[PDB]
Design a protein around this ligand. Structure first.
Ligand SMILES: Nc1nc2c(ncn2[C@@H]2O[C@H](COP(=O)(O)OP(=O)(O)O)[C@@H](O)[C@H]2O)c(=O)[nH]1
Ligand SMILES: Nc1nc2c(ncn2[C@@H]2O[C@H](COP(=O)(O)OP(=O)(O)O)[C@@H](O)[C@H]2O)c(=O)[nH]1
Ligand SMILES: [Mg+2]
Ligand SMILES: [Mg+2]
Ligand SMILES: [Mg+2]
Ligand SMILES: [Mg+2]
Lengths: 155, 155
């Protein structure tokens, strides 16, 4: 009932925004990118009281679940996804580590990374893909909760 | 060729969900209830290129069409329908304003407001009644498009 989650991705994709929206239920219009802190919150996932220990990157090997986050209006971030994917494989020494691909900023119309690209990437990793928006709370809880559901399976 | 539409109803009925599903063609599992923003999208209604200016309540007097939205699994929302109905009559100072009654969340089985009650209410207002689901896109376009068709006959 206690989970250690880790949010990874390129700078400016909304790693901090997604975390704060989950923890403090509000949207941050700006957040210091050099800040890397762990956050804590007792929540209810699928009716079960769970403790979430989330690390907003800017221990790693103590992570049970990982959020691969990019922005749908940021091609470069999507390109950097594989870099972080492989880091997690090495730090965990495993092929099968609970992960979720996250497409943030789905509220923005200036989309450059279409659905097929993201879903093909997730298909190449065999992990779920969720479109999120930290501004509007869209898919935010689902992203973290799905990861926890992935951990439940592995454990 | 341009239309100003206003979506009203009780909190949590899916006003935001119905708007996003129309504009960005996706479903929001959660949306900040305190967010009231105007949205814009050029669409094709019955073959005719139209610009839709939609206000998602949480400007009013400039509304040409109004969506009266409740949830079929929300008796209270249905009860509050007349409240918003009369507000629009006052803000427009008119006895005849293009409106459409919308029963959202039709994808849910836990129904408490049957078709009889809704249709009887729509008949009491002399306006169309549309069953919608922002989750599955059911009746979403038809709801907004019908309202536009109501504006057409009105002018
Ligand atoms: N429109 C929109 N903007 C976002 C969203 N998430 C984050 N942002 C913006 O992106 C900027 C950088 O986000 P941040 O969380 O600091 O990126 P980080 O480097 O991964 O921590 C912030 O100023 C946010 O306002 C979102 O879902 N929608
Ligand atoms: N099953 C289902 N859920 C919906 C539908 N429309 C909205 N919802 C859910 O209802 C919740 C609140 O909807 P929202 O649009 O924020 O209500 P608002 O206060 O009118 O803006 C959201 O978390 C949606 O997931 C629908 O058609 N079907
Ligand atoms: Mg940050
Ligand atoms: Mg491209
Ligand atoms: Mg809303
Ligand atoms: Mg009854």
């Amino acid at each position: 009932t206690e989970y250690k989650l880790v949010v990874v991705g390129a700078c400016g994709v909304g790693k901090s925004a997604l975390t704060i929206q989950l923890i403090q239920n509000h949207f941050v219009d700006e957040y210091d990118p050099t800040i890397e802190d762990s956050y804590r919150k007792q929540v209810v996932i699928d009716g079960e009281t769970s403790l979430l220990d989330i690390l907003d990157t800017a221990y790693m090997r103590t992570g049970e679940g990982f959020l691969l986050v990019f922005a749908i209006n940021n091609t470069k971030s999507f390109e950097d996804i594989h870099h972080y994917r492989e880091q997690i494989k090495r730090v965990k020494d495993s092929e099968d580590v609970p992960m979720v691909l996250v497409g943030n900023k789905s509220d923005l119309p200036s989309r450059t990374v279409d659905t097929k690209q993201a879903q093909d990437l997730a298909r190449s990793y065999g992990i779920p893909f969720i479109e999120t928006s930290a501004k509007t709370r869209q898919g935010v809880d689902d992203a973290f909760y799905t990861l926890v559901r992935e951990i439940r399976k592995h454990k």
